[PDB]
Symmetry: D2
Subunit: 260 residues, 4 copies
């Protein structure tokens, strides 16, 4: 099988990467960073997201694995001392594949599309943020605030969590929308609660006055000018994970927020 | 088709009920309150929940319809002035059926089972509330607080909403757990975020010291003594709704919280 | 100086109490549990609150000291290994006094008054909770929910904190009101935010339908029937603390919630 | 008395301004926009804040009055139809003065000072926001998130409110700090609760890595580069309000968020 390794670029990660490559040479496994089937990320969650966006054109051909040399390592399944055992099990093909939903963002002018593994958010180019929120072509609310966040299931432990969103098991094919500091008074009104949307629903944001927005997708943040629409839907594409040990989502959540 | 009507018992509701019965007599529709196929509720959401728990043994044989003479009327599809048109459309059979998920609660001693349309909650019999939260047999957290709430999708606009939970579209077969005033300090720790569980997962609450709990199911509240386990799962049973007009969940939410 | 010691009644606390009494005998200090000037509490925060309510008639004649053999120990200034040094410093009179504000609750029928060191809360006798909230004789809101909490400054780290309230430095002579799961929809509306009231303001709760309420004051909880009014104001009375080492409130907060 | 009027610049406001000037000519009142004693603002709250920052060097020489031709008008005491009666009462000197606390922000490099009527906030220049929070020279927490907000009492109905802060009566000489989307996980920890600081306390923010910050003061937002410290304290200076009718803060709050 062809494989690649992405390193956080610190010393431990580079060297762990050199050892694993050397380990893989002992199994006739071709390192190919153009068309791999297995992508290993050595670092934290930012390094893993970078690895994901490097290969966003080949998502179904690839299965990902993270190694935790970072701080939190939510998407990681392995600590550095397991790295040698990873090489072995991965070479003999003893793993099963797990798929998590992804988020499609579309931006139109007067079209760009993006895939997010954690979330996509929207803020103004500076100055007040005001958008209308249209759900399946019904006008739902006019949002005044700092911004909005739309999150995948596995993204709900991330920025979504800090905004009061719910944590969502990734077997549920959904996306979740949360507010950033909404204004609510006599004249302005938002739902307040996060909203959880099923696979077949479309949430569109439409400008009211200013048409420039700071749009983010995972760690990337781009300015879009003269925007007509930002459309959110659950993607048809999925990320595949290589699992060698049963490591349930809720245990992952527990270890990351409660203890160990 | 056999049918029954439940009234809030105020004057408008009783009289609207008398008129509809008289209307139904003109179509050879048998009023039967033992084995109806259609149950009409005239009142608010409490009246509708009562109607639901009256027939919890016959859920798949029945389709429900609510008429709003109450205050909020979330589960209502009709205002009183449409009542005459309801009789007609229902008699000629021009409706489609919509199904929403339900919540199964099981309580064990040393077993009682209940079905909830909004939610089931747990509090202490007075004195401190402390439980361990076990998800799919993995121990997730020890909860110290006032109580916990587990909510259906259509229940998320209800008590769940007031506790900071997310609103959840009812096409998603899930249940959602939210905290009531959790204690978080140097020594005590909860997740904080609401949790959204898929159909196949089991959440069990297990006592730590006191074993008496105030358990609620929709409007009903019962004391249980010497409790060993409270087990939550998404039910295999569903509630069926008779729909004559397309009335999407998110429009229902909008009309109930934003305007009109 | 006359003194008393209250023990949590576990083995460590009783024995630490016996040693300190024996230590105090070496200084001609009269143990008097009727009219002490110094009250030492050995246990956690519940033990300290009990000690406070034991002497609520003699608040300005007494200065309190807590010793932490409990779990959190927010009101504690000493760990058990410092107990011997406490005896000494307290006998030679090398301490300064610190005063924190208290909360006055008045309940009227058709009058009972209470002093709270943490907070006083109000819930229904079971069934729905609905009250009007009158501030300085202006009608402010009608509250529908689970209950309300009114907290002293030093109480804001306690139940208030779990309800989203702000932490408040005790040099500020104020009381703070927070909601328990308020209902907010098209027809029902509360402020949502906690409210912070100055010394000279009066907040009165007035029943709407049910007139029986579960009223709490610190760890005590009493049923009141046929209630006409619950009136909250910042008390004229203060609790005095004996301080031997500078131990600022914000450091106390840090040690209790962030680390150490 | 010398006086000036600031207009929102829409048609109603300009014309209401022309009429009031003409009204004031009938009383020998000198319009002076250099050294007035009375500053009238015609518009919404943004127009009023602009009026405040225009005269921040002469705060004790001036008393402010707002006229509501905007949308919310929190700082307004008058609607346009009262404008004629305002001219009269203000000319005959029948008013009393009300003073609200202000917030001092100091920024140091390797000093700029600002006065805020609502709040001052801090965010990064793009990229992650990380600061240490030092209270009275004790290190309290390391904040990771989107930013922080420090608010006056009368500012607590504003941005503070949208971030979950408490509303604070302006007789309390305090400032309140609230988080913008803090990150809390196994490794990162913030207090979460808002913090309310008394007049004599100093809160200093100190950079950890990036030293460029987007700092706001009311409607103004400035980039500061190579920042060493951001220091918050309750100002010695106060804003004076001209009151002709008793209009209590809590009634103002009620009218702005509950109804009318
Ligand atoms: N106010 C906020 O909470 C906020 C603001 C902006 C971005 N973010 C998150 O930061 C992500 C990307 O930034 P970055 O990781 O490259 O730098 P970063 O600023 O260090 O990310 C912040 C933290 O989020 C963690 N994280 C990332 N994905 C997660 C997930 N699915 N579940 C739980 N935690 C997760 C990171 O873990 P590691 O320790 O392994 O790096 C890190 O601890 C965004 O996708 C976004 O979700 C959060
Ligand atoms: N702190 C809280 O928020 C709280 C506490 C206890 C119970 N509840 C809710 O009250 C329900 C049953 O009580 P009740 O209706 O008989 O008396 P209730 O006290 O009047 O119910 C409270 C309000 O919830 C509304 N409601 C019920 N189901 C809803 C839903 N699926 N979505 C949105 N709103 C909904 C009711 O609407 P109507 O105006 O049509 O009656 C009423 O406005 C419980 O199942 C529970 O969800 C809420
Ligand atoms: N949902 C909630 O958060 C909730 C519900 C009811 C009561 N309470 C609190 O419990 C207090 C009395 O109960 P209890 O202590 O006898 O039994 P408790 O149930 O053990 O008290 C709960 C926790 O609050 C802590 N606590 C008490 N006063 C505090 C303060 N000023 N600041 C920070 N933490 C404080 C206690 O500390 P220790 O470990 O030292 O005992 C304990 O960790 C009430 O006054 C009330 O504030 C909280
Ligand atoms: N996410 C947020 O909530 C957020 C973000 C940035 C700024 N702000 C607020 O906006 C203020 C300045 O902006 P702006 O007014 O010029 O434009 P703005 O964006 O229109 O201000 C937002 C709203 O805040 C209201 N407001 C201002 N001061 C208030 C107060 N003391 N109490 C209650 N509401 C108040 C404004 O009232 P009017 O209708 O009369 O204009 C407006 O409704 C800032 O000082 C800041 O407090 C809020
Ligand atoms: Mn990272
Ligand atoms: Mn009801
Ligand atoms: Mn205790
Ligand atoms: Mn404005």
């Amino acid at each position: 099988m062809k494989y690649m390794i992405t390193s956080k670029g610190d010393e431990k990660s580079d060297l762990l990467r050199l050892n694993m490559i050397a380990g893989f040479g002992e199994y006739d496994m071709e390192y190919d960073d153009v068309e791999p089937e297995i992508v290993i990320s050595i670092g934290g969650d930012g390094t893993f997201l970078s690895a994901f966006h490097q290969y966003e054109e080949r998502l179904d051909e690839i299965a990902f694995i993270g190694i935790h040399t970072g701080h939190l390592g939510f998407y990681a399944d392995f600590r550095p001392a397991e790295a040698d055992k990873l090489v072995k099990l991965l070479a003999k093909g003893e793993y099963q594949k797990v798929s998590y939903p992804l988020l499609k963002t579309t931006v139109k002018y007067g079209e760009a599309t993006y895939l997010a593994l954690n979330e996509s958010t929207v803020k103004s180019s500076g100055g007040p943020f005001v958008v209308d929120v249209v759900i399946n072509d019904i006008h739902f609310e006019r949002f005044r605030g700092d911004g909005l966040c739309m999150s995948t299931p596995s993204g709900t432990t991330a920025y979504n969590k800090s905004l009061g969103g719910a944590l969502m098991h990734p077997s549920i094919e959904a996306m979740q929308l949360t507010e950033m500091a909404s204004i609510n008074n006599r004249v302005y009104r938002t739902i307040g609660s996060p909203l959880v949307f099923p696979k077949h629903h479309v949430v569109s944001l439409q400008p009211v006055n200013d048409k420039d927005f700071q749009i983010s997708v995972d760690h990337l943040s781009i300015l879009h000018r003269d925007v007509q629409e930002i459309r959110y839907e659950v993607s048809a594409k999925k990320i595949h994970f290589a699992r060698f040990r049963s490591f349930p989502f809720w245990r992952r959540v527990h270890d990351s927020f409660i203890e160990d």
